[PDB]
Ligand binder design. Structure first.
Ligand SMILES: *[C@@H]1O[C@H](CO)[C@@H](O)[C@H](O)[C@H]1NC(C)=O
Lengths: 194, 215, 225
């Protein structure tokens, strides 16, 4: 009864930046020996779990996220590094008991022109909390009269598209990052790694 | 992609020494950084891994760190002693081309012996070697603790630099060196100059000794 | 517990291939990645390759792409690095290391085998003395020496008269002159009293050739002493 990980990594369609899909899975047997022994990733920074010592501890739920960013944004998704995408699309707490994992997929999302559904959140009139998603198409008002239309007066659509073509630099290629989130709730551990 | 380290470092025992491992390009927080300690001649061994945890058996006087500011990661070696005078390398898997990048290399030395002015000793050629064209120019200096040996070659009329080469400084018994010199000679041009002097600037005197070309 | 043994060290010429082995003993040979790392003399380490759990996925460094092949066999518990087209930059001391997990350190290492591509022919050269005249008779540290010029192998350990008039031999290592030439020399610190008591005869004990001819030193009695 192995835990289903094919739907998270070996998927076909991935989500967007502003709406990161969750993949809560439990009541399984999660073999972690397929993550750290697979030469197909770029970052494997497990924060405070000692990835070698994961096949003995048991947890309760494993939350698997999945979204698409560019090369110069993979290092921004980590505790201790902020920038453009730090408080607009995704913000991680400063405990991160999971393992940030990413790989460069430049053969499925790098067509001529590219898919225009990858919309990163631009300047927002708010802040961001750990594990907080916000799917909103409201035009950003910088302080003037609200347009309440389609770029009426000083309005900007906050879902700026990405330019993904098979001719850009490595720092602008479509990446795919999966960030697991382990936890320990007040319940018997139903998922382990024997 | 490459990792840079200082060539060497020296400090008196009693406190902590640091060694720089600066990432050339790309993020430093990509994968894990692991340091190695290698005694001269012996097989290298892991001294730290993941920059936080310590291998079993390693003394508690080793706890490195990672600075995510300028893509660097230094090692904190507390309790400096004479039993830790060796090389230290860093290593971190980095890149999408599936390549492992080791470190440059750092020769950590401790304060061992006092300072002494290296005397100038030049040796002329011999007789039986001077048959058709064969000789050597030895400007071996001795009695010096620091390994930053720096010499010069000026044949009393010109700073000759053709075929500049030096020998290997041998570690003496009581922590010293015997760095010698080996310059290129003139097989068929022995009448170049009637003298051969050898200068030196290794933290002290700078007198030169002159010898006949073939006597 | 974990112990690795290497075998296959030797000396060849540019073009001749070699075989290096590394046998593991004390764990499962089908649960850890294997890798090779060489060390140039005096320089730093160098990554070579990394093999998969069975042998399917293999990645080599771009410096030796193509002319280097790593292989393993679970039925013998022995690692293999067979290559070809050996050139000058393949002069180093190769090691053998296993990988805990891919994004992790190399736990255990090996002893090491020296593999170089030195040239030159096997010859026992003449040893020429130093003839202490100018600044070695009485000026400063009195000493004298000789020089074994351009020998092919590296077993040479220059003693003095096979221990007959030795007064402290301060020997420094040799060096590569052109491509295979090693001018090893040693200088004994004479107390400046044996210059007129017994004339030194510098001699070595080279095994391959016959460097047994004691070459007379040249005491400059006419000049200084
Ligand atoms: C995805 O497919 C590859 C194909 O070889 C396989 O190696 C990998 O294990 C798969 N991913 C998962 C999570 O099983």
């Amino acid at each position: 009864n192995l835990c289903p990980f094919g739907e998270v990594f070996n998927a076909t369609r991935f989500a967007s930046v502003y709406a990161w899909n969750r993949k809560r899975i439990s009541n399984c047997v999660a073999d972690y020996s397929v993550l750290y022994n697979s030469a197909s990733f770029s970052t494997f920074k497990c924060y405070g779990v000692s990835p070698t010592k994961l096949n003995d501890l048991c947890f309760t739920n494993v939350y698997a996220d999945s979204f698409v960013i560019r090369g110069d944004e993979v290092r921004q998704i980590a505790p201790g590094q902020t920038g453009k995408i730090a408080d607009y699309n995704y913000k991680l707490p400063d405990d991160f008991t999971g393992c940030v994992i990413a790989w460069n997929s430049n053969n499925l999302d790098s067509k001529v022109g590219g898919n225009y559904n990858y919309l990163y959140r631009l300047f927002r009139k708010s802040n961001l909390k750990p594990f907080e998603r916000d799917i909103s198409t409201e035009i950003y008002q910088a302080g003037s009269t609200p347009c309440n239309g389609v770029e009426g007066f000083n309005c900007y659509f906050p879902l700026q598209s990405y330019g993904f073509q098979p001719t850009n630099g490595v720092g602008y290629q479509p990446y795919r990052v999966v960030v697991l989130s382990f936890e320990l709730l007040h319940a018997p551990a139903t998922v382990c790694g024997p | 992609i490459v990792m840079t380290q200082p060539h060497s470092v020296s400090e008196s025992p009693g406190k902590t020494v640091t060694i720089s491992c600066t990432r050339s390009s790309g993020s430093i927080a990509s994968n894990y950084v692991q340091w190695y300690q290698q005694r001269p001649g012996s097989s290298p061994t892991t001294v730290i891994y993941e920059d936080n945890q310590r291998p079993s058996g390693v003394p508690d006087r080793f706890s490195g760190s990672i600075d995510s500011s300028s893509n660097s990661a230094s090692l904190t070696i507390s309790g400096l002693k004479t039993e830790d005078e060796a090389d230290y390398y860093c290593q971190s898997y980095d890149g999408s081309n599936h390549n492992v990048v080791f470190g440059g290399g750092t020769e950590l030395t401790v304060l061992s012996q006092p300072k002494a002015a290296p005397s100038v000793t030049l040796f002329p050629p011999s007789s039986e070697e001077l048959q058709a064209n064969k000789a050597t120019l030895v400007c071996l200096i001795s009695d010096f603790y620091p390994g930053a040996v720096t010499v010069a070659w000026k044949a009393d009329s010109s700073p000759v630099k053709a075929g500049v080469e030096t020998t290997t400084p041998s570690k003496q018994s009581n922590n010293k060196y015997a760095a010698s010199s080996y310059l290129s000679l003139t097989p068929e041009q022995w009448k170049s100059h009637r003298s051969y002097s050898c200068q030196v600037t290794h933290e002290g005197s700078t007198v030169e000794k002159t010898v006949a070309p073939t006597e | 517990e974990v112990q690795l043994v290497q075998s296959g060290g030797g000396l060849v010429q540019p073009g001749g291939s070699l075989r290096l082995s590394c046998a593991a003993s004390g764990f499962t040979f089908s649960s850890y990645w294997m890798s090779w790392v060489r060390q140039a003399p005096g320089k730093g380490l160098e990554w070579v390759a990394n093999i998969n759990q069975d042998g399917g996925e293999k990645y080599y460094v771009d410096s030796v792409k193509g002319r280097f092949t790593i292989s393993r066999d679970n039925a013998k518990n022995s690692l293999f690095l067979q290559m070809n087209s050996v050139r000058a930059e393949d002069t180093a001391v190769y090691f053998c290391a296993r990988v805990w997990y891919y994004y992790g350190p190399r736990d255990y290492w090996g002893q090491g085998t020296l593999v170089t591509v030195s040239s030159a022919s096997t010859k026992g050269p003449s040893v020429f003395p130093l003839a202490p005249s100018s600044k070695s008779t009485s000026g400063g540290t009195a000493a004298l020496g000789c020089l074994v010029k351009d020998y092919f192998p590296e077993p040479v350990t220059v003693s003095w008269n096979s221990g007959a008039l030795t007064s402290g031999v301060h020997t420094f290592p040799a060096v590569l002159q052109s491509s295979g030439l090693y001018s090893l020399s040693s200088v004994v610190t004479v107390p400046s009293s044996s210059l007129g008591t017994q004339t030194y005869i510098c001699n070595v004990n080279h095994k391959p050739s016959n460097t047994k001819v004691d070459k007379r030193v040249e005491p400059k009695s006419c000049d200084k002493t």
